Ligand binder design. Structure first.
Ligand SMILES: [K+]
Ligand SMILES: [K+]
Ligand SMILES: [K+]
Length: 249
RNA sequence: GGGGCCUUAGCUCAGGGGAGAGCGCCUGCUCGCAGGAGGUCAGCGGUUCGAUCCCGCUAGGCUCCACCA
RNA sequence: UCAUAGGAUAUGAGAAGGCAGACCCGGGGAACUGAAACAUCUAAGUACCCGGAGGAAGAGAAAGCAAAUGCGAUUCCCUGAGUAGCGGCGAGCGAAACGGGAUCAGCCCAAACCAAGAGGCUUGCCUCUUGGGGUUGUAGGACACUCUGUAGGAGUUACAAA
RNA sequence: GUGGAUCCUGAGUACGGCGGAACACGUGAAAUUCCGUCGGAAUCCGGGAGGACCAUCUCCCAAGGCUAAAUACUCCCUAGU
RNA sequence: AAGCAGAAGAUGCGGAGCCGCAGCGAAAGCGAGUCUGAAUAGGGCGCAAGUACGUGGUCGUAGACCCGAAACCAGGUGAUCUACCCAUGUCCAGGGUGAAGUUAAUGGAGGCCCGAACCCACGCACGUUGAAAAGUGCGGGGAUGAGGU
RNA sequence: CGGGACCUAAGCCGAGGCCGAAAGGCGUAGGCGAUGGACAACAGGUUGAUAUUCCUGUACCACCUCCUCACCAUUUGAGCA
RNA sequence: AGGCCCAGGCGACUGUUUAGCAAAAACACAGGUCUCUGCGAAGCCGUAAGGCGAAGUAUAGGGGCUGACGCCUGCCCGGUGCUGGAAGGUUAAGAGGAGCGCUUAGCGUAAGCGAAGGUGCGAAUUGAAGCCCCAGUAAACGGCGGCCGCGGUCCUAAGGUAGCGAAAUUCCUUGUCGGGUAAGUUCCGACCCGCACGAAAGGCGCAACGAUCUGGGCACUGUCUCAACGAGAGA
RNA sequence: GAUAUUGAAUGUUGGUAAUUGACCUUCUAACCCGCCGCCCUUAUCGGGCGGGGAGACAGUGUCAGGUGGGCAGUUUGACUGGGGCGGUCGCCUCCUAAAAGGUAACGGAGGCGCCCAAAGGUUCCCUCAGAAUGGUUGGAAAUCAUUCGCAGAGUGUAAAGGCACAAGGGAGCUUGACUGCGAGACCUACAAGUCGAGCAGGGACGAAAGUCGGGCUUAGUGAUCCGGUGGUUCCGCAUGGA
């Protein structure tokens, strides 16, 4: 009841369900695997669960959408308890190209919910996707086209997964509106519109406060400029602006 | 009057090593591209191997003081 | 309910209060001041308040001092010595023992145990109250032994008390 | 006076931790003494002290009491300086 | 020296104690030397008249040449003045206005009005070694109230 | 007449009691405490100096019984309370 | 035995106050609001006992601010306070003793090693409130922008709304214009470049009230032009 | 918050070999009641007795942390053409400074709170700035070459005094940027500061003479107390240790 204040009002929905997962693992003494919780929902769950222990794995290390195991003080989990299936996306690579937008659009097009798949990995040699094992056969059967490319899915082990723009700058403050303006190369008044409407996120939390102070190692997500990361804050200049470093995706 | 701070390209700002970056403005190309435009670095005189970034002064603009009989 | 609380009556040269503005032992306890400021510190356990006294008080018969072919209760004086030491190691604070003197004195219990009685029988055990017993350190006492005294010695200043 | 079969010889004490005070000694290397609090012995094959502490040695026997004199003082009284 | 004897004396006794006769070194220690140092070196400090008592000068600790704060602390004494409160009394000439209510009249409200006592103290003058350590005179405010006493 | 031998308010004191280094603080029963309640005497006269106080006249209140009279009554028995 | 009138500031009012240089625009006030307080209330006095609160009980009691009435009371929760709180971080005594030192029975030609006990330190681990942190809250403390050409741009927690404005606030200033006067640094009304108003440390109005402050009139006068005479007290 | 007062049970979860912890719930008997009835007792005190409530909590004690101008004791510099405000405070160099030395002002100018493992030591060798004339890049100015050339350069750094038998530049080998000291001087209120031949130990460089106890010279620093570290033929509170 006195947890919601710490999160947003829309985020209440997840928090209610996150409390219902903790309820199970305490009383029934059994691990609860979840449906690839979003990077934000990782942060929320971590809080709602409390310290019921928690584990998280999205197949490869550095998956955005990862599935969480809520386990007690015993039954420390394995890599396959997360019920993850990796696939290699086969297509006529010489003729057609698959991009992240097309493959994401195709996954959604076959009716797959965002919670039923993790990250879509693009390397030089392979395009791979990670899904929940319960949906693996459905996705393999239905995902026959991505954009203009005819595609097929080959099952692989997680071990077979084939896993910047540094921009040293100065800002007046570490307010959100100031950092966005700097990163996105805009007027601050324009950046304030972005923040206020609800287009910027900070670690996948929608921050609508222009004056929110941004810390070192915060993934900002300006809808319109993509995504960028305050990696370094490096003291202050002669004329008193924060020496900073940005790295766009 | 005294102290304290400021003076960089159209605009916003980076920056003892020979003055940049974005945006605007121009180049051709149709939300990104592709090269330009533009600086007495307030000025002055000097420290020196070179000064926007030393150091001393002059502007100007702000800021704080100018009290006690 | 037994009781007990409470109430009543009797007997008490029982207490109370005072002061000598002193001395003594306790409880509580400043500040100015000094430190060339000031907080630790100092002033000072002072002043002051309170309680208790007594003609004196307090201390006192080694769980001591010491480091000798030792000393032998305590108190007080001389000395040790402005030493040792303590100390924003500042300002300041400051011993003790030995040595020399004054004066001198040593005692009683508690306990073991014994005897008698009482009330809890916990049922031959336990607790309590009188009297005896006993009093200490290279241990003493109980307890046993054999001795020995029961009236010479001691006494109201402790060591019983008129 | 002689014996050491047993028994007795001061317990919520000594002592310790924490917090204070007293010791010339200000927490210090800090013995010793006392108070509050909490913990808490041994008991003669025992215990205490000798300035942290241990060992050895030496000296002593706490946690019960009493005790004159030498000492302090003078509102007074007497005699005097 | 205390102390004992002795006029509250001198004095006698009393050698514990004190200072000096040897220094050097932090110290163990060594000693006319010693410390430093590897050193017979060099250098430091030493070697090569005190003491007891008295007078005087000065210093220390004491109030310390005398007089003087504003203050600080401790323990008492004061609410007969004054502040507020509590209990219980008491005071407020006269006149006016005319709320509610009642049936234009009636009615008699009020930190209501004018205005003595009473309370107050706004202005000015006077007084200022006063009549008076806060007043007097002329005016002034409140005067049934959060009133005076 | 005013006060006491009557009453109580505020407050104060306070057996036992509660609390507190000491001293003490607080407080019950119970008291004290008028500024309040209650309560019987008036007019005139008089002295240099007192007067509901003395004097004159006429009163009233409480209490008492050597007495007088009437009435009621001696254990459902007056009456007091 | 009332002088009166016109106009303005302040405070609504009657009250109250610096005994003895200030009576006021200061305090109080009825009204408003915020807040605490479930009763052995909170608050307060007292070491406590005992009390007040109250012989009351949320329509009550305490505290803060505001100050009749009328219209109203804007924006900012970053900071500070208050209230509440999830993760994460931090943190006392106490608890806990892994280790280590000193000591020495023993053991070693010595050097040194070294049981047990005593003793002196002692790490991990554990450990509340609080704090960091997060959320709310402005009739809480407070704060309510620059620059350039309504737009741009920088900065901020957010940039002053309504109303008022040379004001008990305006330095410059005797601002400017108008009114009143023969002549008006004061006064009144406008204006707004508000040095440095502004919404309960309330804003703007406001009838009644004032020994309030301020400007102007009528009346009146020895206040004055400008003095003169008389009475009394002192001299 | 710990701990005492402070107990009993049931669960559950630690840690030791069945005892002792931790926490949850329950219990009643301590403790509490500014609740009711009864009694002491004419009593809204107090106490006793019986109900009820609450309960090992609270309260109180000790200890601990937090908060805490509610309260307490204090501090809050000096110079200064009055004080405040501004500026300054130690060290070095120059000028003022009057041809020894010293010498003031909120007089005039600047530096310092280091740097360097060579930018120290020694041995050997050397000479700089700039200009003229000639040169593919290449220019006024890089690199040659020639002549001229008291220094017009350099000397880690401020300035002054010095320095070309170099104190300036280069190279080799090195660690004397030594230990013990020190006749005697300078400076000086003290405290400190400065110079020093020479002696010993053991070195570096050099054939040797010799030079070397940092740097061309003069700034580059801070008393005591207290505490840390290393060393130590010292002391060690009966003795041996500590
Ligand atoms: K010598
Ligand atoms: K003398
Ligand atoms: K002057």
């Amino acid at each position: 009841s006195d947890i919601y204040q710490h999160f947003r009002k829309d985020e209440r929905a997840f928090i209610d369900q996150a409390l219902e997962w903790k309820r199970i693992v305490q009383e029934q003494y059994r691990m609860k695997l979840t449906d690839f919780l979003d990077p934000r929902e990782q942060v929320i769950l971590s809080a709602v669960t409390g310290q019921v222990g928690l584990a998280f794995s999205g197949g490869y290390d550095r998956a955005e959408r990862k599935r969480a195991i809520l386990f007690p003080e015993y039954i420390t989990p394995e890599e396959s308890d997360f019920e993850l299936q990796a696939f290699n996306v086969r297509y006529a690579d010489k003729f057609v190209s698959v991009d992240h937008r097309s493959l994401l659009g195709a996954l959604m097009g076959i009716g797959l919910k965002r919670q039923k798949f993790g990250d879509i990995v693009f390397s030089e040699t392979a395009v791979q996707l990670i899904v929940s094992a319960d949906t693996a056969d459905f996705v393999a059967a239905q995902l026959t086209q991505a954009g203009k490319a005819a595609v097929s899915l080959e099952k692989i082990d997680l071990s077979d997964l084939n896993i910047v723009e540094i921009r040293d700058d100065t800002v007046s403050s570490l307010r959100l509106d100031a950092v966005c303006a700097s990163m996105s190369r805009q007027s601050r008044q324009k950046s304030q519109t972005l923040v206020k409407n609800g287009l910027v996120k900070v670690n996948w939390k929608v921050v609508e406060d222009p004056s929110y102070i941004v810390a070192e190692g915060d993934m900002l997500s300006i809808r319109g400029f993509g995504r960028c990361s305050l990696t370094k804050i490096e003291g202050k200049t002669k004329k008193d602006k924060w020496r900073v470093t940005f790295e766009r995706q």
